[PDB]
């Protein structure tokens, strides 16, 4: 835990070779008090998130952590809200630009990498701080099938079978680990969230985004659609 | 952005930021490079934290050109930036000279990008060392580029976690006459010396470079070698 | 049209030029000096477009003098000629090109005498003798017929007079007086002006 | 200690010390009063003098034919802002061939002075202003601040001990609309004299007046020209 | 681009950076300039004179033009930059006014450049002081002195660098009309003034004179030795 | 000093500089926004610090577009520049696509601009929170609120200022979904008068503006007669 | 550490206050305005006998009808002096008339607060000027005297004393100056005050003096003239 | 941001530049380089620090760089910095040749790199180059020459000099043994080995631990050449006999 | 035309393990001859030469700029440049001025630094390379050179035969071109030697 000079204020190397500022940005992701779970199936990919509206006057329809990047790419953000929205906007811009110059839809792994590259710059440049959010992307690849990718504040990204983010990240990973060692995929995801939250939420308590092989277009399940999986 | 240097000389004449970037490298996962008579091998630990990480998704051993490949120890997202830069430098060279860039000319250009982040304004050095291998003029080449931007040509070396033990192991085992196929074995064995538990063909990654070019061994091939 | 002429000998370079400064149909000056001293043993004769000639020549002169001040020793004739060409060539494709024709004469301790020819497109050529302007057309052949590599300076002055006399009777322009200078190992020496 | 050096550094109480320090500059300046009736807008300022052999510092500047100002604080900044105001008025007359409405000009000042209070290395303008003008909406008296805030008032006072003038201003503001030119100028003078020391009094040396009304271009009265207004004060 | 203010005012109106630049001049080798009747002499100490060093490469007395030369004290690297700037300015002046610059004119230029570096963003002041000598077109000898702050004065005899005060005290009580009567005497004064600080008198001094019209001249070891024997 | 710059995260992952800017909005007058069945109503407890100020000075209600209104809280200078930014956005949108900018889009754009001042040491976060209200036949009634961090949310009822924790409970007890602009103007006025402190923060004025079917989609200040009634029904019912 | 544009708790710019402190260490300059004209007198403050007294210029000609007396960091003044010189010539070129003293002072005073280190461009000042000026000239309003300090504040004065003895000299100024005062008396009174506040024995070499009267151009006093008034 | 600025190019209270002084500390720890100038040539001799058995040899030399047809240099201190400077000297020499169609005189080249080094000390806010160079060259104005420059941007011509580890010792040893005008390349080379035997604390010198370029004239052509190991071995042998 | 302003002819010929490069020596402005020994062929290695024809000023500039780049290239990489690589370097250099090109059509002749394999090529003003196995011509009398080369060139000629072939090609080709002549310089590049000869030519 050594420290010298301004190695805890700006993104510079500390005595042990660590980047404290980047590590602090990972703690900022848990400040929102939410947890996200993405599960990759055999022919589908689902993203479940904790929908909390503790205010009553708030318009529940405007409260969501699931965003549509492209027609076939959806994502779930975790962490600082404002930072998340800017990253979602950046991803959308990157995706549209990719198609405009290359002639085809950007692959999920390429989009995730592009966002991670941008995040890396913040860990090397001292003038600006890293974003306090986490991005999880899901989409159907035409050659590889269902895809689940996640990048963070450190600029690190990877492909996953199933992965989580948020306050109960360590607990969601332990639940999904045993399961990996459509309907089941959606169920497993919801289960993982419910298991680590101990609440068994209703249809209006969570959000669901999915992409299947048959129906590649990113979709968001409604109250009646979420309840159906909850009743079973 | 800040226009003043974040790396500066201490009263002992050291550049601590670079010393600290090197600390990052030394805590990185292990990497090994061996230059055989008829090729070079690069081999690295890619143990993942869980079994949820799709190991096949991201690669630490990366091609730069038909004939050059890279591996690294230290900070993965810093590596990504370098890989992209080397790829752009190799293309730039090919567009001028219409011959694929010699390994040592790729190493000098990349190392130069590294030195600039020890002196330019507002930035920290790269928390990465590279091993670069290539084949050109019917000769195999292996180089290390560190965070200071210094480079060195090796017969064999190890970096990341447990490199000092690794090197001593390569002193004893390396010889010049050593063929590739054997080189590959002693690469994989240097990794074993510091590996946690049960080295599979999905938690190491291996690239080879020879006359045919540079390529990542397929997991199927790594298995045979294990 | 302005006239320049150079004759290189075994150990000297003889140069001459007309002294007429003209404005349309009238001679505004009859003692105009078209030679610019770049150094102790280097002369730069420049003719061409009004303005450009003096601007380019003085620009070169200032840099040559600066070179000597910065290092202690002077630039050699060859180096100075190439410096001049480079500068003239750089402006050729630029927005402001210098339309000047030059003759660079000089003497070097180890390289000996030298005479360079430079047209407005910055083509540099070393030569035993050369000329510029419309007068060169009527004098170059005279140089061809009488010039020998071992020509003495006294004989070179005689050769130059022949060229000047040819202009007097054949050339349509009124060039009654010429500046005559010589460069050897003792530096630049002014010779008696040749007038008619 | 660590929060009162930069304008871009928010303190823990939710304040910006640098903007507060820049407001102190206006409070150290010489007092000036601004009030309006129904057809006129006047400015009255106390001119300060470094020494007895020095001339009283200018405090009332010209902006346009329908706009005039009174400054307090850093004079260099006051001249800076004045130039900006003059240009804006000139631009309006060049483009639309009509005087720039006072209210619109005040908003431009607010925006211009707001910028420097958010950028690192920059500082707030250290000058307070009193703006008198006359457009299609009648006479106006605006007050610009160093923190880019501005208020539309019936009468205002800024500078050293301007609170006393403000107190007097509030007490006699009920009969300002119906006041006439001579009458309205007296009130300002009276309020301006309230901020002065018991011993000292307003004369034709330390007093400057600027008026702009329905049928009168913004004019400034100095020394001998302020005799008429001065004659009558109790 | 670096836009940080390095030279700023202190509580008692002091520019610390400029004073630190003057501290660097104090550690420089002593340099003495004496304005004679028909001659100008400059003399710098050689400090540590090694036997393996090429004497001609570390001369502290350079020429800015045919009539203008200068000796400096302080940061040698900084001096080189200033000297080059001045040389370029001398050729610029010679090209726009068709005349050799006056000593005061180039002194003014160097002083102005030094001041510019005490009120600019991202730069530090030049850590040198210079002695400028030469002759103007009319023939009158000149001697100027510039410092890091940018101020400059005309002198009769001045001394800069380590021991400037000591040499100044001796120069005041030794500079008269019967001390610069002849060229030799003027040179002796500078050598004698340089002997008050420079240790091991003899070859530890670099001398150079500038007589009217002719180019700068540099005295040789044996030529200086002879002068020392007469003193 | 972990709270000196916006480009510096503290050990527990917080950006204190942005939080300090939220403190500036916390110690300011309260403004309210209510989304009724056919429109939005804005009400601000304008604090009159001096009697010299003219009736209608330091307005905290702005018209950022023909169909959009803005109610702010916190540093007025910061709020004013944000209003100009909002106006620029609306204007730019119409020039690019040929029609009135949707409220949600306008709010998202302005929020991103606000979010841009919370990542660097070169600039400081905005010291103000504002509300955006608008009404159109193709969109219905929409109400959004943006704070110093840059988070933008849609609401049914919203409060910003020093008394927002008390005004929310008063807004809670109301059936705004079935209410109308004409009826919500009296409740807004009533609520503002309730949260307003007597002893502390004395002397205030009531600012009222609305946009909806009653005003044919145009945002404007509530009429004097209607405001009179609302204020008369607010004082009588308190 | 604070930036150059940092405000203090009393509402003042730290740097400008420190720049005003630097003016107190300068030489004493006196300016008196009469109906006959304006006279300027500043002490040269010679620190050594070898230093040439004519190389110390504390009073300069801005134009034919405008003179200037500086005090404080003399090197900083040069830049402001050139600006004033350019402003008057620019005014003459464009309007075919002479610029008024007030106008020239105003233009020069506008550069006072033009310094910073963040939003500035390649060529901006990193700190304020550390010098006080005295502008004396004659326009259509007759003889005029203006005083400008480092804060950018300029004001007309009947009599002003800047420099190290500013306080003591100002007291003698107000106790000896009247509206009917003549030029001859002003020149004498200023010299009488300068000699009383000078640490060195005032003479015809250690002081400068210039006058600007109706008709006559800016005129610097020669040694002879100076001596006559010293009796 | 003033807070994080290190303030690289400002003076200390004694009129010192600390970054330059600390850059110099770096160098005094680098591998020893020494230059000796003879009548018939000039030579550089450098301790190698790249010594590990698994290092490949692939390159001309570790620390000796050719700059143009007529000059070479060796460097001490921060290797990656030296790479920036050596590439810049090559660019400067080729700029000169392009303009004048002649090789750059050795002192003009040195001076022009040192201008780049002094600028880093005065403006821009970056740390200096942590490098000292020795340069050897032949030109038509001065013939055989040897220069040294340092991170301050200061340079000076020498008959013999040394930089890097134990330079102070090497210098006093060269002051004892170097014969002005009486030196031949054979004599120079001998002295190099003598001085290098004493500045290196490995007792046995070893021709693997040193690098020696010589620079001579043959038929109006400069010849720069790294001595091969045999020659160095012999050179070492020859010292043992003494 | 700008290319014929100064005149000049350059040609390269391939032989059995040897290359030949020749050029005229005339430097003239329009119809007037100025000198008779203007260099058009420049060395770019022991066995690598570049011939340049076209505007004299551009001939000198390109040659000098190419030398600048080659020198730096040979300092960076520690080896002699290969003939093919030089061609690309020149092409890249010529293509940089795509819309304001140097008026010169270069011809390269040499042998590989390590394999000593004959190589000849020609590039147009904008830098479009053309590698041939027989010969390449460039200049004001290219048509005449084509005729001569096409009928005189034979495969696998030895050093002596190659010299005679290129000499006869150039000599007879420049005699039908008014702006090309005043001497001919021939360079014979072999594995262990380079032979430079000046032919007996017409001086009119």
């Amino acid at each position: 835990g050594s420290s010298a000079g301004f190695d805890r204020h700006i993104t510079i190397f500390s005595p042990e070779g660590r980047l404290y500022q980047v590590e602090y940005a990972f703690k900022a992701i848990n400040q929102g008090g939410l947890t996200s779970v993405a599960v990759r199936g055999k022919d589908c990919a689902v993203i479940v998130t904790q929908k909390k509206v503790p205010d009553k006057l708030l318009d529940s329809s405007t409260v969501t952590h699931l965003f549509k990047i492209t027609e076939n790419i959806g994502c779930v953000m975790t962490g600082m809200t404002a930072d998340s929205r800017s990253q979602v906007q950046r991803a959308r811009y990157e995706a549209a630009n990719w198609k405009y110059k290359y002639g085809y839809e950007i692959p999920v792994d390429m989009l995730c990498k592009r966002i991670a590259d941008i995040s890396q710059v913040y860990t090397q440049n001292a003038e600006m701080r890293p974003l306090g959010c986490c991005m999880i992307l899901i989409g159907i690849d035409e050659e590889q099938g269902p895809q689940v990718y996640k990048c963070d504040p450190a600029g690190y990204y990877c492909g996953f079978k199933a992965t989580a983010a948020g306050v109960k990240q360590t607990e969601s990973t332990s639940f999904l680990e045993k399961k990996v060692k459509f309907e089941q995929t959606v169920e497993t995801a919801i289960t993982c969230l419910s298991t680590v939250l101990s609440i068994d939420f209703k249809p209006s308590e969570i959000e669901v985004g999915v992409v299947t092989v048959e129906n590649p277009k990113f979709r968001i399940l409604s109250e009646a659609e979420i309840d159906a999986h909850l009743v079973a | 952005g800040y226009s003043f240097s974040l790396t500066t000389f201490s009263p002992s004449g050291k550049l601590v930021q670079i010393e600290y970037a090197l600390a990052a490298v030394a805590g990185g996962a292990p990497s090994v490079g061996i230059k055989a008579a008829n090729g070079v091998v690069l081999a690295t630990e890619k143990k993942q934290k869980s079994i949820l990480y799709d190991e096949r998704s991201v690669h630490k051993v990366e091609p730069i050109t038909k004939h050059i490949g890279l591996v690294y120890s230290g900070m993965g997202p810093d590596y990504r930036v370098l890989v992209h830069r080397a790829r752009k430098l190799a293309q730039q060279y090919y567009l001028v000279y219409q011959e694929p860039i010699p390994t040592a000319q790729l190493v000098q250009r990349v190392a130069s990008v590294m030195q600039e982040y020890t002196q330019s304004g507002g930035v920290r050095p790269f928390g990465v060392s590279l091993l670069i291998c290539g084949w050109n003029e019917g000769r195999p080449y292996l180089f290390q580029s560190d965070p200071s931007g210094a480079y060195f040509a090796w017969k064999a070396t190890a970096m990341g976690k447990n490199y000092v033990n690794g090197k001593t192991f390569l002193e004893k085992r390396y010889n010049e006459d050593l063929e590739l196929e054997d080189a590959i074995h002693t690469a994989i064995l240097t990794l074993k010396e510091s590996f946690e538990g049960q080295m599979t063909e999905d938690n190491i990654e291996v690239g080879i470079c020879n006359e045919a070019g540079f390529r990542r061994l397929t997991p199927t091939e790594v298995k045979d070698y294990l | 049209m302005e006239y320049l002429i150079g004759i290189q000998g075994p150990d000297y370079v003889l140069v001459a030029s007309d002294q007429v400064a003209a404005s349309s149909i009238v001679q505004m000056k009859d003692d105009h000096d078209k030679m610019f001293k770049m150094s102790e043993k280097i002369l730069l004769l420049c003719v061409g477009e009004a303005g450009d000639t003096v601007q380019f020549a003085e620009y070169i002169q200032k840099n040559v003098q600066l070179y000597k001040m910065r290092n202690g020793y002077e630039l050699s004739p060859t180096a100075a000629a190439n410096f001049t060409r480079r500068n003239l060539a750089d402006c050729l494709r630029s927005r402001t090109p210098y339309h000047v024709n030059l003759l660079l004469a000089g003497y070097d301790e180890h390289e000996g005498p030298a005479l360079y020819y430079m047209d407005y497109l910055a083509a540099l050529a070393k030569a035993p003798f050369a000329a510029h302007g419309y007068g060169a057309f009527l004098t170059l052949s005279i140089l061809d017929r009488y010039y020998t590599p071992t020509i003495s300076r006294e004989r070179a002055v005689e050769l130059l007079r022949k060229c000047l006399e040819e202009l007097q009777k054949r050339f349509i322009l009124n060039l009654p007086t010429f500046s005559v200078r010589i460069i050897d190992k003792n530096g630049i020496h002014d010779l008696d002006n040749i007038s008619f | 200690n660590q929060y009162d050096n930069d304008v871009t550094v928010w303190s823990p109480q939710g304040r910006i010390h640098q903007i507060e320090y820049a407001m102190e500059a206006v409070k150290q300046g010489s007092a000036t009063v601004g009030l309006k009736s129904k057809t006129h807008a006047v400015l009255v300022a106390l001119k300060r003098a470094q020494s007895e052999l020095a001339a009283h510092q200018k405090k009332i500047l010209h902006v346009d034919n329908h706009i005039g100002i009174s400054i307090a604080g850093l004079t260099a900044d006051a001249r800076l802002l004045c130039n900006f105001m003059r240009q804006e008025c000139l631009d309006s007359r060049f483009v639309f061939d009509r005087p720039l409405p006072v209210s619109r000009l005040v908003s431009l000042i607010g925006s211009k002075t707001q910028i420097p209070t958010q950028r690192y290395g920059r500082r707030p303008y250290g000058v307070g202003l009193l703006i008198a003008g006359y457009d299609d909406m009648g006479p106006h008296i605006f007050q610009t601040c160093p923190s880019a805030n501005y208020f539309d008032c019936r009468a205002m006072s800024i500078g050293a001990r301007s609170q006393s003038a403000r107190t007097y201003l509030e007490r006699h503001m009920s009969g300002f609309m119906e006041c006439n030119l001579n009458e309205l100028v007296k009130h300002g003078l009276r309020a301006l004299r309230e901020t002065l020391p018991a011993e000292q009094d307003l004369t034709t040396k330390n007093v400057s007046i600027g008026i702009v009304g329905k049928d009168l271009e913004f004019t400034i009265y100095d020394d001998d020209d302020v005799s008429p207004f001065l004659e009558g004060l109790e | 681009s670096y836009d940080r203010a390095i030279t700023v005012f202190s509580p008692d109106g002091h520019l610390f950076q400029v004073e630190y630049a003057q501290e660097a001049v104090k550690k420089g080798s002593t340099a003495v300039g004496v304005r004679g009747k028909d001659i100008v002499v400059l003399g710098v100490e050689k400090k540590s004179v090694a036997k393996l060093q090429d004497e001609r490469t570390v001369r502290k007395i350079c020429a800015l033009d045919d009539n203008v030369c200068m000796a400096f004290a302080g940061l040698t690297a900084d001096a080189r930059i200033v000297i080059n700037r001045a040389r370029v300015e001398c050729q610029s002046h010679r090209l726009t006014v068709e005349d050799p610059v006056t000593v005061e004119y180039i002194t003014r230029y160097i002083a102005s450049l030094k001041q510019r570096y005490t009120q600019s963003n991202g730069r530090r002041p030049f850590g040198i002081s210079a002695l400028i000598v030469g002759f103007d077109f009319d023939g009158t000898p000149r001697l100027y002195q510039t410092d890091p702050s940018g101020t400059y004065h005309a002198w009769k005899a001045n001394a800069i660098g380590r021991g400037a005060k000591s040499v100044r005290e001796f120069l005041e009580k030794n500079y008269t009309d019967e001390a610069i009567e002849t060229d030799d005497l003027t040179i002796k004064l500078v050598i004698k003034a340089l002997l008050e600080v420079v240790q091991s008198g003899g070859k530890n001094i670099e001398l150079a004179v500038m007589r009217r019209d002719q180019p700068l001249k540099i005295l040789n070891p044996e030529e200086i030795e002879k002068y020392v024997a007469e003193i | 000093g972990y709270d000196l710059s916006a480009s510096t995260f503290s050990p527990d992952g917080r950006v204190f500089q942005v939080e300090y800017a939220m403190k500036a909005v916390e110690n300011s007058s309260t403004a309210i926004g209510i989304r009724c069945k056919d429109g939005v109503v804005f009400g601000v407890e304008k604090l009159v610090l001096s009697k010299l100020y003219e009736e209608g000075s330091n307005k905290r209600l702005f018209n950022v577009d023909r169909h959009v209104g803005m109610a702010v809280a916190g540093l007025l200078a910061d709020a004013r520049s944000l209003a100009d930014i909002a106006r620029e956005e609306a204007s730019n949108f119409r020039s690019n696509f040929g029609y009135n900018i949707p409220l949600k889009h306008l709010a998202d754009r302005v929020a991103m601009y606000v979010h841009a001042y919370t990542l660097y040491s070169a600039v400081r976060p905005f010291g103000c929170s504002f509300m955006l209200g608008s009404y159109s036949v193709n969109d219905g009634a929409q109400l959004y609120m943006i704070d110093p961090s840059g988070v933008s949310y849609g609401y049914w009822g919203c409060a910003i200022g020093k008394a927002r924790q008390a005004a929310k409970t008063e807004i809670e007890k109301l059936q705004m979904k079935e209410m109308t602009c004409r009826d919500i103007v009296k409740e807004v006025a009533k609520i503002i008068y309730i949260v307003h402190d007597e002893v502390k923060d004395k002397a205030f004025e009531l600012e009222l503006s609305w946009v909806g079917e009653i005003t044919k989609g145009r945002h404007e200040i509530v009429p004097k007669d209607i405001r009179e009634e609302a204020e008369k029904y607010a004082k009588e019912s308190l | 550490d604070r930036g150059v544009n940092t405000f203090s708790p009393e509402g003042r710019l730290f740097q400008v206050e420190y720049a005003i402190e630097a003016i107190k260490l300068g030489s004493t300059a006196i300016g008196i305005q009469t109906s006959e004209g304006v006279c300027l007198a500043v002490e040269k403050r010679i620190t050594s006998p070898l230093m040439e007294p004519s190389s110390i210029e504390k009073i300069v000609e801005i134009d034919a009808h405008i003179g200037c007396a500086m005090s404080g960091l003399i090197a900083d003044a040069k830049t402001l002096i050139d600006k004033a010189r350019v402003e008057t010539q620019n005014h003459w070129f464009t309007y075919n008339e002479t610029m008024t003293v007030e106008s020239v002072t105003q233009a020069v005073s506008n550069l006072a607060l033009q310094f910073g280190e963040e939003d500035a461009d390649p060529g901006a000042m990193s700190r304020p000027f550390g010098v006080a000026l005295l502008f004396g000239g004659v326009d259509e309003k007759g003889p005029q005297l203006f005083h400008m300090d480092p804060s950018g504040t300029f004001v007309q004065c009947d009599a002003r004393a800047i420099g190290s003895a500013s306080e003591g000299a100002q007291s003698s100024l107000q106790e000896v100056y009247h509206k009917s005062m003549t030029l001859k008396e002003a020149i004498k009174s200023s010299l009488i005050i300068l000699k009383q506040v000078m640490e060195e024995k005032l003479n015809a070499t250690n002081i400068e003096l210039a006058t600007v009267q109706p008709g006559q151009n800016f005129h610097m006093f020669t040694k002879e003239e100076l001596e006559e008034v010293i009796k | 941001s003033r807070r994080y600025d290190s303030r690289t190019t400002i003076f200390s209270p004694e009129g010192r530049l600390y970054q330059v002084e600390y850059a110099m500390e770096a160098i005094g720890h680098a591998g020893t380089c020494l230059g000796i100038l003879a009548n018939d040539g000039v030579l550089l001799a450098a301790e190698r620090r790249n010594i590990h058995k698994l290092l490949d040899e692939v390159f001309f030399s570790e620390k000796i760089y050719k700059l143009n047809e007529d000059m070479a240099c060796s460097v001490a201190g921060i290797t990656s910095d030296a790479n920036v400077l050596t590439n810049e000297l090559r660019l400067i020499a080729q700029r000169y040749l392009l303009q004048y169609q002649e090789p750059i005189p050795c002192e003009q080249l040195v001076t022009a790199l040192c201008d780049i080094k002094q600028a880093y000390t005065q403006f821009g806010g970056k740390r200096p180059f942590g490098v000292s160079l020795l340069y050897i060259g032949w030109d038509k104005h001065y013939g055989f020459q040897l220069y040294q420059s340092d991170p301050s941007g200061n340079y000076g011509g020498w008959k013999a000099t040394c930089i890097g580890n134990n330079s102070a010792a090497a210098v006093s040893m060269l002051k004892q043994d170097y014969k002005e005008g009486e030196m031949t390349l054979k004599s120079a080379l001998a002295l190099a080995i003598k001085v290098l035997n004493k500045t290196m604390d490995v007792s046995k010198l070893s021709a693997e631990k040193v690098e020696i370029a010589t620079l001579t004239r043959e038929n109006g052509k400069t010849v720069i050449r790294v001595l091969k190991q045999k020659e160095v071995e012999q050179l070492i042998k020859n010292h043992e006999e003494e | 035309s700008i290319m014929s302003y100064n005149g000049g002819a350059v040609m390269a010929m391939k032989g059995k393990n040897c290359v030949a490069i020749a050029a005229d020596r005339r430097f003239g402005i329009q119809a007037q001859m100025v000198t008779t020994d203007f260099q058009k062929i420049f060395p770019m290695g022991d066995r690598l030469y570049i011939g340049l024809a076209g505007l004299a000023t551009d001939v000198q500039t390109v040659a000098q700029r190419l030398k600048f780049r080659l020198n730096l290239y040979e300092l960076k990489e520690g080896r002699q440049i290969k003939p093919y690589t030089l061609m690309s370097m020149v092409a890249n250099l010529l293509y940089e001025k795509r819309f304001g090109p140097y008026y010169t059509e270069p011809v390269i002749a040499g042998l590989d630094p390590k394999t000593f394999k004959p190589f000849i090529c020609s590039l147009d003003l904008i830098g479009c390379p053309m590698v041939t196995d027989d010969f390449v011509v460039s200049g004001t009398c290219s048509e005449q050179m084509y005729g001569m080369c096409e009928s005189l060139w034979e495969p696998n000629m030895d050093p002596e035969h190659l010299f005679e072939t290129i000499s006869q090609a150039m000599l007879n080709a420049v005699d039908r071109d008014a702006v090309s002549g005043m001497g001919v310089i021939v360079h014979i590049i072999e594995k262990d030697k380079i032979t430079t000869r000046t032919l007996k030519a017409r001086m009119d």
Side-chain angles (χ1 to χ4, degrees), chain E residues 160-176:
Chain E
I160 50 178
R162 90 147 160 276
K165 191 249 253 284
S166 59
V167 173
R168 219 189 238 96
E169 294 332 61
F170 158 85
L171 266 163
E172 268 151 342
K173 301 168 233 153
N174 285 103
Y175 184 92
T176 47

Side-chain angles (χ1 to χ4, degrees), chain F residues 184-224:
Chain F
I184 289 263
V185 159
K186 295 197 336 166
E187 321 305 332
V188 153
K190 176 188 183 257
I191 283 155
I192 288 284
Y193 263 93
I194 290 159
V195 299
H196 171 74
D197 184 319
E198 4 269 324
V199 265
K200 296 237 153 21
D201 323 334
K202 207 201 280 74
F204 93 97
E205 187 214 303
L206 178 63
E207 264 191 272
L208 289 164
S209 70
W210 59 355
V211 62
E213 215 143 6
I214 171 67
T215 75
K216 325 198 125 114
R218 165 187 295 299
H219 178 263
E220 3 144 310
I221 297 277
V222 175
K224 174 130 275 224

Side-chain angles (χ1 to χ4, degrees), chain C residues 82 85-86 89-90 92-93 117 119-127 136-137 140 144, chain I residues 5 27 29 32-35 37-38 55-58 60-61 64-65 100-103:
Chain C
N82 282 107
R85 193 203 90 83
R86 162 74 36 243
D90 287 340
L92 192 67
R93 264 157 189 110
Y117 177 99
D119 81 319
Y120 77 91
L121 301 158
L124 178 63
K126 185 160 203 287
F137 289 109
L140 277 158
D144 277 319
Chain I
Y5 185 84
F27 162 58
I29 289 146
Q32 178 182 88
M33 175 272 295
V34 188
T35 71
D37 61 359
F38 185 81
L55 207 56
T57 181
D58 282 342
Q60 289 176 317
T61 294
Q64 276 152 15
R65 297 215 153 117
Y102 286 114
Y103 296 102

